[PDB]
Every structure is written in C-alpha cells, then in structure tokens.
Design a protein around this ligand. Sequence first.
Ligand SMILES: [Cl-]
Ligand code: NA
Lengths: 274, 9
Amino acid sequence: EPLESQYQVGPLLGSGGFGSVYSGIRVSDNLPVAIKHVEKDRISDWGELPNGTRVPMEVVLLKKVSSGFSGVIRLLDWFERPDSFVLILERPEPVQDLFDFITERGALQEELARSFFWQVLEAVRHCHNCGVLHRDIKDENILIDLNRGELKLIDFGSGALLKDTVYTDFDGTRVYSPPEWIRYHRYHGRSAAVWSLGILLYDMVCGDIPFEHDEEIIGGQVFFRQRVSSECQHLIRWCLALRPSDRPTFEEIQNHPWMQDVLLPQETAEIHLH
Amino acid sequence: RKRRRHPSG
Ligand SMILES: [Cl-]
Ligand code: NA
C-alpha cells in the first residue's frame, strides 16, 4: 500500500515548470517507472475522479487518456501525501526527449520528421477523443523510445478538459502559443493545438522553432532557415495561419500530401534510430 | 545561433 516499499527510487531525471521527476523501478516486477512529484501549493487546477476523491487536473487528464495502448504516457498509479501528489508513470528505456534529440542531430530528414509528426498527430487525436486537451505540445514533452521508434506525449500538467467554447486561461509554453492568445488572451482548443503542431513541425524540419518573440508570433511570416520541400512548407504555413478558422483540422493535416507513405515505428527505429 | 528550452508552468 505505501509508496516507499513498493518502488525503488533512483536518480532525478529532471525538474522545472513540471516538478521533480525521478527514475524508479517497480519492485513487484522491476518495471521501469518515472516518479513525478508535484507540490500541492503549486497546483492551480483541480478536478474530481469517478472515485469522488479530489485530485489535480493532471491526474484527472492522465486517467482519461491512459485507457489502453498509445502514443501517450501511461499513469500507472498515484499517491496523495501531506503537501504533494506523487504520480507513477511509464518509463520507456532507452529513451531520449525530442528536444535533446533535435539539439544533437539538428534538422531532421523529412522522412523522419514525417514519421514523428504523424505519431504526434495520432497521440493528440487520442487525447481529443478521450476529452483531453494537452495545451503544451512541444519537443520537450515528447519522448522517443529509441528501440521501438515510438513517440510518447508527456506532461499533462498544463492541460484541460476539452471543450468547444473559448479558453481564457493558459499556462503552457508561450513560444508554442498562438497569436490569438498573444493578442487577445483567448483561443479555441483544437485550433490552438494545430498552431502548436505547426511550431513543432517547423522545429523538426529546421532544427529550432520559428519564433521567440511575441511580434514574430503575431507577424504571420515563416522564414525557412533550412532546405524544406514545398509540400512541407505548405503544411507548416497552413498550421500557422494567423486566423484560427484558416488552420487545418487534424484530418486535413493527415490527408496532406506531405503526410503520405509514413514509415511504421519499427521501420523508423531501424532506418533512423539504430 | 542559440537554441534553448522554454519553461511552461
Ligand atoms: Cl503565456
Ligand atoms: Na532507476
């Protein structure tokens, strides 16, 4: 029943605007886990479970998506302590986050960007089908299982229940945030998500994100700093349309010509990752 | 040119 006897805690994996996350192994069966600790004092969004006991939204959102197998990180278990919640998450091994991966390798070949971006699209559709809006899609919140060639979306700490009405609150990453949030402090979930996917795709094919300053975010100009195919530039530009209603749906993204003939995850590992 | 992480929170 207690947290300390049931998991062996190893080293810190990271910390920041997410918390303090340790590597661990579940003693029951030596399964690799990640043990995430969040201070109750630093949690602004709370939900309630089917159980009825009150939890941080992050927990609510992870249970809603941890249904079955996917490109979303699985919540295995959680615990309440006096001043915090501890979340036990899946840990792929070996793993690298997409931010370090792009730093190390630079601009990704399009074939590899295509397989990755496709898998991010499938994961975000999953969240949306489960009623969850992540709100912080970025390379930092994507893990790559280096052996399976599978991507996992992590860190739902800035997410919300998906709704069709307007959002007026946001605590995700500003350089992935859309221009309607910058200027008006309003967005709709899906269209904001697609903008952020546009940033992510540019990040993949160019080796860093397109915009750092507000004025660039609202300016509506995408300069390509790497050789990128016309079809890919068109997709990025569509995703980063200034008017939200001008952005593509997930379907339109996935039917885009640049998105056809995607590699399987195993093929991706074999060609690009071993 | 400088590539960096960006905190959310
Ligand atoms: Cl912001
Ligand atoms: Na460990």
